[PDB]
Amino acid sequence: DGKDFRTDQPQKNIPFTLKGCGALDWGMQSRLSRIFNPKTGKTVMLAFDHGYFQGPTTGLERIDINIAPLFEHADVLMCTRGILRSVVPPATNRPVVLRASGANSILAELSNEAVALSMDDAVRLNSCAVAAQVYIGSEYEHQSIKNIIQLVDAGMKVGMPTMAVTGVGKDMVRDQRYFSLATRIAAEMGAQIIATYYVEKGFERIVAGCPVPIVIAGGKKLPEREALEMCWQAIDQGASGVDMGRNIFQSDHPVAMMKAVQAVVHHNETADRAYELYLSE
Amino acid sequence: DGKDFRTDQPQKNIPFTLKGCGALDWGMQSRLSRIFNPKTGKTVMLAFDHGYFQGPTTGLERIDINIAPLFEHADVLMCTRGILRSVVPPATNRPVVLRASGANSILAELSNEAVALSMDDAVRLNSCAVAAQVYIGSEYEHQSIKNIIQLVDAGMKVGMPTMAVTGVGKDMVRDQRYFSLATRIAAEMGAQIIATYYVEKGFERIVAGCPVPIVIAGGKKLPEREALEMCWQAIDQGASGVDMGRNIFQSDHPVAMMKAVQAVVHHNETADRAYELYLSE
Amino acid sequence: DGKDFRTDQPQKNIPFTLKGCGALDWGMQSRLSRIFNPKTGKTVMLAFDHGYFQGPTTGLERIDINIAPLFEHADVLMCTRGILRSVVPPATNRPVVLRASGANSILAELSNEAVALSMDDAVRLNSCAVAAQVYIGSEYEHQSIKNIIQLVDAGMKVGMPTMAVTGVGKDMVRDQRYFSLATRIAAEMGAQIIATYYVEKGFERIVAGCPVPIVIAGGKKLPEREALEMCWQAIDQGASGVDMGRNIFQSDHPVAMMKAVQAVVHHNETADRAYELYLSE
Amino acid sequence: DGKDFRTDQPQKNIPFTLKGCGALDWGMQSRLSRIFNPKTGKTVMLAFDHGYFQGPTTGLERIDINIAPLFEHADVLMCTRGILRSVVPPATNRPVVLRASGANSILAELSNEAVALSMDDAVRLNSCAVAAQVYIGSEYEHQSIKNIIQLVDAGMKVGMPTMAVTGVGKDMVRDQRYFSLATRIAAEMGAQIIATYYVEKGFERIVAGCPVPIVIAGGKKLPEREALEMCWQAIDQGASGVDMGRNIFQSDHPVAMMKAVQAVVHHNETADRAYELYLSE
Amino acid sequence: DGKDFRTDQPQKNIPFTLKGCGALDWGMQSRLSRIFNPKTGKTVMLAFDHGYFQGPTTGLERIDINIAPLFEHADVLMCTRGILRSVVPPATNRPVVLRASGANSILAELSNEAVALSMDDAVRLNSCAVAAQVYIGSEYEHQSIKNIIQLVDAGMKVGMPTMAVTGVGKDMVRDQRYFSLATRIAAEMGAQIIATYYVEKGFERIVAGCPVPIVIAGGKKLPEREALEMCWQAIDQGASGVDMGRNIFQSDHPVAMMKAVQAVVHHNETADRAYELYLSE
Numbered sequence A, B, C, D, E: 001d002g003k004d005f006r007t008d009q010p011q012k013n014i015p016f017t018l019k020g021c022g023a024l025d026w027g028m029q030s031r032l033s034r035i036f037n038p039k040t041g042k043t044v045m046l047a048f049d050h051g052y053f054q055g056p057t058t059g060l061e062r063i064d065i066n067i068a069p070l071f072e073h074a075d076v077l078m079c080t081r082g083i084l085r086s087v088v089p090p091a092t093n094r095p096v097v098l099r100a101s102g103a104n105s106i107l108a109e110l111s112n113e114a115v116a117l118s119m120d121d122a123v124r125l126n127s128c129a130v131a132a133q134v135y136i137g138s139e140y141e142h143q144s145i146k147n148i149i150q151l152v153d154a155g156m157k158v159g160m161p162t163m164a165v166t167g168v169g170k171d172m173v174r175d176q177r178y179f180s181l182a183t184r185i186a187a188e189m190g191a192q193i194i195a196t197y198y199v200e201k202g203f204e205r206i207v208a209g210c211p212v213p214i215v216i217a218g219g220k221k222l223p224e225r226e227a228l229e230m231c232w233q234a235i236d237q238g239a240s241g242v243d244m245g246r247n248i249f250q251s252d253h254p255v256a257m258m259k260a261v262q263a264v265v266h267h268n269e270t271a272d273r274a275y276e277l278y279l280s281e
Ligand SMILES: CC(=O)[C@@H](O)C(=O)COP(=O)(O)O
Pocket: A047, A049, A050, A165, A167, A217, A218, A219, A220, A243, A244, A245, A246, A247
């Protein structure tokens, strides 16, 4: 009778502010919190998935020795289930984003992708999301959009987020009007995280037209403090993070490279004080 | 070129303020919005499912004649699929909460209920929610809780809210500590709407202790002037609406009783000016 | 001794008058009534699914912003699940018609569409109908019908209506004899809603030849006084509503435009007395 | 061109007037229409399923010999799948209603019934409806209603009507208050046809309180001049037909009895005028 | 090339050290890493599912106010789906252990539990594990074990860990020989996490005899200095962590108390360098 139900204190719902994800089930919003830091709304994603069509890329020839010491320093790991089960220790304890597409290679057509793992297996490995390429304007574009749909159709049954990454190929003009077309279609079809390329004009425009968080692709490795201005620019006009690739594992200062990348995204750091985490390491 | 992405304007998630329902999928939140008014957060639910174990209850002998003109002034209709399909015209265009429990009758033990319709048919009939009686303290309580468990498990797959109605047994009172026990376990098991009966002391402690909306059922017929004080009291110390059966259709002016409960719930009306326009019609 | 079954007054079924929808289950008839007002039998549909193959179309760069305040003034909203969950709040409380086709784009063949979301997810989102493009006379005409067939097969299990939208090419003469070919087949295939374009000669024959309701596609952006004339005569020749977009959200006065569209549709307003209080607020 | 769409003539829906069945899918409305003649809205059903718990009951020892010549003068046959496949020839071309309950007998508890055939097989047998006993007030009242629930849930997936037969005990009074309770519970649960017994006072009130068609069970053999008054009284009080087992096949002039029953049910003839067409044969 | 395959340096599998979990799939091993900290192999679990059969016990009347600020201090949360979706924010970003048993209450038999959630929904809710009570020696012991058997069966398909919690009666004077029975059977049946009570004589034989990790349940409220002696004694004698419900939300220093529990489990902190992790507030 002296117990306190606090009748004086009205119940009020606590808002979920991750962009365009305010009308999702708890679990899907839960997995998204593992990727996107709840304080920050952004992520630093470590991609080491390129072997799914490229093979032993420079720096991913040995995942266990040169990429293993880098896991602890990533917000979220991105790889394949083959790489995950083989060389990525479960005890590493980081959110994982699975490559669920493949059946392409650098010797044949690049857009000829199919779903590379079932949602059944994405769940069994306790994934936070699945990722697939969308290839608008390429030969097998129809199929590429269909891969997303199947993952999204499957993803809703289980609360598993889908990442659509807009994949450019051969000779294709990277501009804002294309990626605006490309990112939006993926988001329009239902993808909840978008991975894209930074564009020097109108990146502000691809993010705005995209209702859901947007992440940056690294591109080819530049000298180790390079376009952290790219990251800084990306974060400054709305990118929700970076899914950096070779730009990290091929850096010759891999643990010290991302301590730099953290700062630009979460620490709202100037691009040129990213070098203040220096390569004198 | 002439496009306006309003880059000056960051995208913002709009909070869903309905109590304990801020982390549900769009469709489930959508279904809750037909029932729970999105700007007042409350409901006036018309229950006439009483015949599912009582037969032709008084006021309910002819649903097509005496209840048909009331569909139109109700927020939500509550009946069985048998009544819904037979005499409730689809063109009524009101949210329906289906009675999904039964296999008991006033001739036997009354807590002896089982699921009376599959989620398949609730979806087929475009239900906004499914409802079942839970009988805490009764001979057959275990099964009644099991019914909700099944309905919630089935309901989550499809975005269908589940309503639990606290059916009291064998005069075991019917005080606050009992309804706190009944409502919370039900809410704990996963039901997003809870129907309970009003008590004259401490109804505020039942509402506060329940993580999801609580609406009260009308009970046996009272003088309409004694019955809107119940509504006024329930809503004022936190009820998120009403599920009023017999205090509507047993009255001499159900349509005028209608508006009066409506006046109390949504319009924050004091008790007797709601009947000061009960007799105005 | 106190019951009144009013045996003198026989039960009489109340007819469902919606054209060609008199032999449907309650739930399917229920869903059609959120869309078609049961008193007028008509609809005003706000289409903002344009981005599903076009990207950030002019007027849809910010759905979150410029088209969102217009939701309240539409009878039914039409969009994608990607857009719906991201930027359309559940509290909007409007019937939704989901874009259920896609995998095409402005860079490739435009008739090459596949089903873009499962019936599983349409239910989960509490859709009122699903829509797909049919491309009669086009390269992927066959597949476009197959998608329709597939949607009807899934919809019938669950009581969900399918809307067929006529897909035009850069090749095709738009006349009465053609839309009669396009609309009839879709209706013949099982579609309960057909979306087509107005023709200035013989539109009365397109309406007559279709056993189910016909709604108008918006067509190219017009001066608003041209689009209410488009609206008035089609409804004058039997149309059951509009599936309008750019004549509303590209208008520089979107809210004032739909009230003008409601009046022409519903209130049998002549187009130039509809313009009366087009300039209200 | 010379086509006649006769656009001056709007399409108008033709109502399905069968009581409480105006909101059913076409196929379900189709099956109910084979049973209930749409011109009279009534039926004469020849029930010979008695062997499912009674064994070779009197008059039914030889279905192939003393019941076979009666099929043609019946509107719909009611039997079990065992009798149907074995001794009822397919070429009979009459509607059949399958007994879908059993597993009881005259040597044990008579309410102890379970579902006796899957919906898979009712369809396989081109059934127009499935039937089960409901045993209100009995030991297995719970089970008997659950049997109905399972059949109605299954029937809705397939457009198969379910008939509920008020299985009554007994030490228990056959008054209107009982059949009103039994019939209402069954109809409320979803059964589209209810078979019950005629009572000399307030049967019209059993009819009025049931939203869906009511057909009467024949009961034990009466003098045929007495059974035509039961028929006359029942139809006069709102009943939609007959479910006549023993008052037909136990008569020594069964064919002439069904014509006598036909006259009362469809052609609205008096009992004493239907009686001299009971003779004449 | 620019390749470095380190042929001199063979790949080596990283051993997974969690007790009895060296033969599990990555995903299952992954989920256990969110619960048992990879540094220590230990956990501090915050249980507040008590209401699933007790209703609003003291400290749990309002989860959102007095339990919400504690999310910050446990390794893993243990609760129900009803509490989770309603009052636990996804942005909490915490490992969750769902209550997967219920259908009991304090007014009836307490061992009368059933499986309370589909594995489907635990996955949808991104659980790290599901938990159920085992009631060895009680009247409904059989079902409680089957509940465990079923959850593991569902879990093994999906890589979802099952926790078995030992449910005691006041039949039993509870000692070491008995909890040895309860813990072992469950682990034997397949549960990978075990919850037990401390016994002051022979707790060493329960942990050694249990092949999979054991966490101790707090039990009823005791003074914090000896309750931290419970934590120290259990952890020091091989227990792998705590599943601490009532002994935290008992304190007038709940928030400052778990740091005392925190330190003892993770750092092998002395019980009474721990009584005063009060300080200044
Ligand atoms: C198939 C791909 O697109 C990968 O190459 C990838 O996305 C990794 O990131 P980056 O290193 O390309 O930026």
